[PDB]
Amino acid sequence: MTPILAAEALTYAFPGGVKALDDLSLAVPKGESLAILGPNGAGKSTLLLHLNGTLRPQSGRVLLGGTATGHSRKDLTGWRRRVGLVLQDADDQLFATTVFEDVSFGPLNLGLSEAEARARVEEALAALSISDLRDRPTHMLSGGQKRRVAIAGAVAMRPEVLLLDEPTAGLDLAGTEQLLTLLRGLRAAGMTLVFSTHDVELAAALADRVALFRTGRVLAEGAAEAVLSDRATLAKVALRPPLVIDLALLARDHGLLAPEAPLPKTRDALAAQMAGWTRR
Amino acid sequence: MTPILAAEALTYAFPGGVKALDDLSLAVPKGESLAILGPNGAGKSTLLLHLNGTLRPQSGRVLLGGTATGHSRKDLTGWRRRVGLVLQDADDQLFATTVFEDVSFGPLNLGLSEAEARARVEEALAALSISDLRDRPTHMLSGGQKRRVAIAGAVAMRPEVLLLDEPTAGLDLAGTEQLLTLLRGLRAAGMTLVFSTHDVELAAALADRVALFRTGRVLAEGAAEAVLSDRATLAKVALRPPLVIDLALLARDHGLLAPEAPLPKTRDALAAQMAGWTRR
Amino acid sequence: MSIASIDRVAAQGHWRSRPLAEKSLIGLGFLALAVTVPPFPGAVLVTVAILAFTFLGARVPLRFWASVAVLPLGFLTTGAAVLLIQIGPEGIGLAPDGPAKAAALVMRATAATCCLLFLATTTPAADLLSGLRRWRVPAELIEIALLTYRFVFILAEEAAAMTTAQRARLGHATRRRWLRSTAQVIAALLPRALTRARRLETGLGARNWQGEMRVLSTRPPASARVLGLILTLQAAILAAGVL
Amino acid sequence: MHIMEGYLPVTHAIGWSLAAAPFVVAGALKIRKIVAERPEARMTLAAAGAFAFVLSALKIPSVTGSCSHPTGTGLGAVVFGPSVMAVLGVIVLLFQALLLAHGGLTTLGANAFSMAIVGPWVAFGVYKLAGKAGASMAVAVFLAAFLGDLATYVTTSLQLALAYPDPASGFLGAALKFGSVFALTQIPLAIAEGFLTVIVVDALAGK
């Protein structure tokens, strides 16, 4: 199955000199959740900005549906119609004045009619449970509500792929759980999610596949199960496993947990293993 | 009169309407670090603005040496000299092109000569391990170093208490671990830190005392281990215990820990006691 | 903060959703009257008219309205007394129709100031800017205007948080320090506004074009019916006041 | 500062709107020119206007015993030179009317003429004259802000005078009257504003 989205040999340097993306290759299978995991400054965001056509690379190419993307204004429209992007700071993509008006913007830019735009806005607001916010002035929104207005704004265009830059940033637990539910729903309607984060916990909750990122390079890539337990490989991008598995592997080091089996992934499963411990 | 800083019966509504702070009392012991834990929108930042005189309450008061603060400019000067403030976003704090220039602002403001102030600056940059950044224009600094210049500017006035609003916001793991180091270093030199957050694992790694916040009210207050082990009360502000503390508490019920034993709170302390555990 | 004060009332208010054309003929209609109709019978009619709509129609919190309705009073007493005092040959004394003209200025002015306060507290500025669409004013001038209004609140909170920082250190100790402190905030605000503009440029691109910013409102159309009703209650008051 | 709402009769109100309109249309046209050439000038223009507004709302201590808000006439003129200002001046004025109660809509027009137009035009002339006569950046900027301000306050005080000629003395009479009474607040303002905008341009160059 050709990837619905792919990077081949991507190289990008700022007009400073340093290379943000370094001979990068990545494939996004259709329908799955892909975390781009890695520390601050690894150029994960720079990679997202390529994948929706905002940035041109020095070398390499972005493949859409198996076809090399172009740069006609007609070409670039379908690239944005099909690959959506949500920046970290929602205020960088709301120019707004009200929530409804802000979400209307995308549809109108796709050559859609008002009636079609107005319908797209309703679908979007519904899909993100902010329909009652339809007329709230955008500056009078919480941080979380602003991230939900920004996603509603992207999904009003109907992308196949939604790119999310650090989507949980700044959120409390409750806020994280609501967003996770809404994201999972979008994955459920067959939307492909690619998100970048330095939070292994976000990757743990939302990702099917994981790509370890460091200094403009994909360092490793595999099933979320495989990557998030690789204590050794995570160590090289300055990360640790999700807290449950890390403590479970802390239990394994001291021999409390047998090896070659059953790493606890949920917290309660980890508590369940404490019953075997005794003391010395 | 032993507390170095205290809030008593604090009531504040913005001249809008909602009570940001609602009959709030909180106490900070000298030399200790106090996490003010609670979800978003609980008025944590609003509390910090009272603790340095930025905002006046409608009712209630702030006490310094065990003595109530006033709101004269002679009082507010002595108040802010002793309680420094570090906002969430460093871009809201720095104005000078030059780093040395910005860290200078505080000390010069006190009345220091220029040599004394220069000396203060040098001490401040040292404490945040950015002494090499001394002459860089502030605008071309990474996010993290901008954050150290911001704190540097605050510790240069040598406050008795340092207030930090959401200090790890935006930091990855390494950045959180590094920031923590400088924070302990500040405290090891005898300062009092109060950080507000909504991350309970951050509360576990850095706090002596923890105060749970809900809608402008302290819901519980005490030793971090006491508060951060209250699975039921944490639940009422939409939180859960920090996994090390949670498990360490299960070890205490299951007897793997001594009644006497403090209680670990950290992987370091959790692992050290896993060294005396023995089945499997 | 004080920037957002009037703006939230017109954001959160009972008449928020009422049609712009209806609100804006009340406001700009009576306002037109207040400046044209001779003061005594004229301005008093408008004042009670508009004070009705601000309280009969919308229900603007009056404590709030008071706070906003005062500052004018200060600039105002001054004019009234200047009209009352006379200057020339013999020097400085009491003018002939001083109280006549002072009273007339105070009346014409508070009536107009109530009309303005009506728009500001019931209809958001953005909506009014949009209402410029049906006048001939070009789309890019409206768009710049809407986006400015949006930038105002982002910058206002940045200005606020910046004045707090300065204060947290001792930027406001001596008047000397205070003037210079405000100055550094201003100079540091501008690069922040410009980088905001560049970043938005990128952000809006994720949805196709940056510039050319067409947005769909949810404003209801009203009725040629009550605009019929409003249009010569404003010619009712119009001539009962010009007699 | 501004002439409040309905402080001016309809004939003077329209008169000032007509007198300001040619300059306002001038700047409007330049803007539409740069926006077609550079579409992102929508954003940067909106940033320039919002900046102009927020600073005009900040808190400045006076030379005298009052308290005032800066009136970025000089600054805007020196940083966003004048045609553009006539146009964003109109915008800043509108929001000051609709957001702060400060302006006036019937007086927007009278106000547009002095602060926007005139205010920038003096500040800019004075900026370039001082410079070419050898003034350092700091002194040029101070004469720009101080005389620019002073000019809006002279213009405003005449417009009022035109509207309210005193019975004994004529326009001349009222000019002296409005002029001397508003001097009590405004010349300390014009001076402090001068101090203010210097420190900004300084800091700005530094950045």
Length of chain A in residues, anyone?
280
| Nearest beta carbon to residue A54 from set C7, C147, C205 | C205
Q: What is the spatial distance between Cα B244 and Cα A243, in angstroms, rounded to a whole number?
A: 9
List C-alpha distances in Å: D140 to D62, D81, D114, D187.
21, 14, 21, 18
Q: Which amino acid is at B178?
A: Q
Q: Smallest Cα–Cα separation from A188: which of A215, A155, A220?
A: A155
Q: How many domains does chain A have?
A: 1
Q: 3-class SS at B182?
A: helix
- C161 and B16: CB-CB below 8 Å? no
B 173-232 residues with CB below 8 A of A? 173-175, 198, 201
Q: Smallest Cα–Cα separation from A79: which of A68, A87, A88?
A: A68
Q: Which residues of D touch B97 (CB under 8 A)?
A: 203, 206-207
- C120 and D204: CB-CB below 8 Å? no
D 133-152 residues with CB below 8 A of C? none
Residue with tokens 């602003």: A146
Residue B235: DSSP 8-state: G
CA distance B242 to chain C (A): 32
Q: What is the spatial distance between Cα C230 and Cα C25, in angstroms, rounded to a whole number?
A: 7
- Which pair of structure tokens corresponds to residue A263? 């790493």
CA distance D160 to chain B (A): 36
Q: What is the spatial distance between Cα B227 and Cα B35, in angstroms, rounded to a whole number?
A: 11
CA distance C161 to chain D (A): 12
Residue with tokens 């949670």: B246
Resolution in A: 2.8
| Nearest beta carbon to residue C170 from set B49, B92, B110 | B110
Residue with tokens 């017109």: C10
Q: Which residues of C touch B16 (CB under 8 A)?
A: 8
SS (H, E, C) C102-148: HHHHHHHHHHHHHHHHHHHHHCCHHHHHHHCCCCCCCHHHHHHHHHH
| Nearest beta carbon to residue B277 from set A169, A174, A280 | A280
Residue with tokens 């601050």: A40
Q: Angle, nearest 10°, between helix axes C175-205 and C139-168?
A: 140
- Which pair of structure tokens corresponds to residue A30? 């259709």
Q: Are C170 and B117 in contact (CB under 8 A)?
A: no
CA distance C44 to chain D (A): 14
Q: Are B44 and B36 in contact (CB under 8 A)?
A: yes
- A256 and B246: CB-CB below 8 Å? no
Length of chain C in residues, anyone?
243
- D206 and B95: CB-CB below 8 Å? no
CA distance C158 to chain A (A): 13
A38: domain CATH number is: 3.40.50.300
Q: What is the spatial distance between Cα B85 and Cα B55, in angstroms, rounded to a whole number?
A: 13
- Positive or negative, the CA dihedral A40, A41, A46, A47 is negative
- Which pair of structure tokens corresponds to residue C155? 């910058």
Q: What is the spatial distance between Cα D68 and Cα D192, in angstroms, rounded to a whole number?
A: 9
Which residues in B have their CB inside 8 Å of a CB on C? Answer: 15-16, 49, 52, 54, 73, 77, 80-81, 84-85, 87, 89, 91-96, 105-106, 109-110, 139, 153-154, 157
- D206 and B98: CB-CB below 8 Å? yes
List C-alpha distances in Å: A212 to A11, A183, A237.
17, 21, 7
Task: Report residue B221 CA to chain centroid gap.
Answer: 15
Annotate chain D with DSSP letters as a single string. ----TT-S-HHHHHHHHHHHHHHHHHHHHHHHHHHHH-TTHHHHHHHHHHHHHHHTTS-EE-SSS-EE----HHHHHHHS-HHHHHHHHHHHHHHHHHHHS-S-SSSTTHHIIIIIIIHHHHHHHHHHHHHHTT--HHHHHHHHHHHHHHHHHHHHHHHHHHHS-BTTTBHHHHHHHHHHHHHHHHHHHHHHHHHHHHHHHHHHHH-
Q: What is the spatial distance between Cα B42 and Cα B35, in angstroms, rounded to a whole number?
A: 14
- Which pair of structure tokens corresponds to residue D175? 């000019």
Annotate A137-185 with DSSP letters as a single string. -GGGS-HHHHHHHHHHHHHTS--SEEEEESTTTT--HHHHHHHHHHHHH
- Whether the CB of D97 is below 8 Å from some CB of chain C: the reply is yes
Q: Strands A33-37 and A192-197, how do they pair?
A: parallel
- Which pair of structure tokens corresponds to residue D126? 């004075």
| Nearest beta carbon to residue D13 from set C35, C115, C125 | C35
Q: Are B138 and B99 in contact (CB under 8 A)?
A: yes
| Residue of chain C with shortest Cα separation from B152 | C169
| Nearest beta carbon to residue C165 from set B15, B81, B93 | B93
Experimental method: X-ray
- Which pair of structure tokens corresponds to residue B36? 């003010």
Q: What is the spatial distance between Cα A205 and Cα A176, in angstroms, rounded to a whole number?
A: 10
CA distance D130 to chain C (A): 22
Phi, psi (deg, nearest 5) at residue C98: -45, -65
CB burial string A30-68: b at 16+ within 10 A, e below: eeebbbbbbbbbbbbbbbbbbbbbbbebeebebbbeeee
- Whether the CB of D76 is below 8 Å from some CB of chain C: the reply is no
Q: Strands A209-214 and A33-37, how do they pair?
A: parallel
- Positive or negative, the CA dihedral D139, D141, D145, D147 is positive
Q: Smallest Cα–Cα separation from D187: which of D142, D150, D157?
A: D150
Domain holding A113, by residue range, is: 1-280
Neighbouring subunits of B (3+ Cβ pairs under 8 A): A, C, D
- Whether the CB of C178 is below 8 Å from some CB of chain A: the reply is no
- C11 and A137: CB-CB below 8 Å? yes
- B240 and A173: CB-CB below 8 Å? yes
Length of chain D in residues, anyone?
207
CA-angle at B178, arms to B177 and B183, nearest 5°: 95
- Which pair of structure tokens corresponds to residue C113? 């100031």
